[PDB]
Amino acid sequence: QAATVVINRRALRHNLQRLRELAPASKMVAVVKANAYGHGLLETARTLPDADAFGVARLEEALRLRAGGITKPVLLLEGFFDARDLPTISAQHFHTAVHNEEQLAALEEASLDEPVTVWMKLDTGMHRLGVRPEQAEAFYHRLTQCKNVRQPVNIVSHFARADEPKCGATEKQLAIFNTFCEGKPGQRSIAASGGILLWPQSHFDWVRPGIILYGVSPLEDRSTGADFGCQPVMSLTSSLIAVREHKAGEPVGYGGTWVSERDTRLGVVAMGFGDGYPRAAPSGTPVLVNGREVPIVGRVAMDMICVDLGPQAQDKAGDPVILWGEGLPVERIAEMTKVSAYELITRLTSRVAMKYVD
Template identity: 55%
Template sequence: MDAHGAIARISLAAVQHNFRRAKQLAPTAKVMAVVKANAYGHGDLSVATALKNEADLFAVARFEEAQKLRAGGITQPILLLSGFLNADQLQYSARHNFQVCIHQTEQLALLERTPLAAPITVWLKIDSGMHRIGFTPEQAEAILARLSAIKQVIQPVNALTHFARADEPEQRAVTEAAITRFKQATAGKVKHSALCNSAGVMAFPEAHADFIRPGIMLYGITPFSDQQGTDVGLRPAMNFTSSLIAVREHKAGEPVGYAGSWVSPRDTRIGVIAVGYGDGYPRMAPAGTPVLINGRRVPLVGRVAMDMATVDLGPEGNEQVGDEVLLWGEGLAAEEVARHVGTIAYELVTRLTARPRWEYVD
């Protein structure tokens, strides 16, 4: 018996491959590699270190994420996609070569009145249709004029936007309109532009501009609901595995797990996997969600618990305690698992807890 608990095996070579695939799709653009949310669950410092000789810029969502990269030895510029929240963060950003996104007038006013130890690079966030943060295209001219008057801001400033529906092929016209709004608001007024998230990189080459901003595709996952990463030349960067800790004979008509939500229609064998929502495997994964054991697909049955999940091995199943179980990764795409669960692969890979063991395999 050689059973083990959940393991997240991360291939940094796969991350590098996916980065180069993004470059292949946008050969004239620089790359802003998105490593927010712990590099989408893959380890931000490890991923940034693997890409430090290739990425032109790293992007994060939170100030603390940028601090962690700097403390870990990452020397490239780092863009704060949500900008700064107070004067201390702004001053720290200037000292440590963080670039900042400006998306609201309160930030702009703080920038105007806060003395900085060094000039700072600013990206103006244009709301092209997401309607969360950012200035409207109609506001852009006035905001750019105010930014141009700030001596401690490196001139000219840059601009970016974030597409709301680039991952929906049937809504192509919506993204095309967003591209037009952004270009009309910024043409001839900014130094660099960045429009494309992963979906934009793949589907809207006309919007690649000066910088692309790949996120989920760096980790081998496609943003499109009808595809998986391998369909578009990506390699999954995470293999999430565990092992069987029990195999038991099970009679027809008997339930498995909490609330008896699944009852076997036949005599069978049940495998118990050392994984649960305490590891980040989704509690709402329904019966029928696939896992791979020794290359064979078997379905989840019963409710996922905090520490265990159960699968129907079938009456002829010969799996044994200690056999490794692939929950998602090479051979079983996270996108497919997410479709069964009713979520997106982004959530699967970012929600893993601190309990699984992390291994970097190359």
């Protein structure tokens, strides 16, 4: 009963449906990269057979989905990293982003038994992956002439600042996208969680929900998944392993970073940065013990967190702890720790047990 991630399948199902309601003329790429944002790659795909496609960061992730029996299209959002992977991508029926000359040249040169669906990736201001506007027309035209590309060619981009509604970058990216796509056949996709929730004019043909599919807000404005009618999917849980007396004036943890002002009782939780809980968490960060809120005291260690229960607290070794979950949104922990909700949910280690419910 130590560090466990409990994944609520009913919440997942709900969220995909709730997102369809917000984007009712758009198909869904369920984004499941990085072990489905910490929720389990294969189990998340298995929970969502109504998704129109799954979205992954890397070919290895797509192959893992196929290995576990997943048959729906998988979009390689970064494309492919070696020309020698094209026969697999063709045979496996993965759709691929194409963002550079190397990938384009490989598609021109290869002999494949079946052509492949492509999403040409346009750099519209993020400046990470993608073909730049001034190179994009010639690039696109070569893609349309490739016998190894199943026509028409689709067009994809991604917003850098969709979470800042009051700033002009999204509208700039959008106008670049729209200028490029004019008169072209091919499906259009630019919106992920932020686009879906705040930019209805960015929905087009396909949207790609990631963090909000897991019932977690993409914004850092205090909002939670529930503010958009999405239900939190993950709870990170554990157990007390000690309840101990502690006297006034006595420090706790490494570096003696917290000192009690009174006599009290401390709880020790079987959870640490070796499980994925941020070492950054300050004293005062909320944890739930038997469902009431108590503060972290002293530094988070690799395997343990101390909490302040109070001097006659009746909590005991064995009792349930919620790091985030029912009553304690991950976005609250994000705000209190200054750690992005994205990183909190995703950057867990393999030590955490995975449990699925409903």
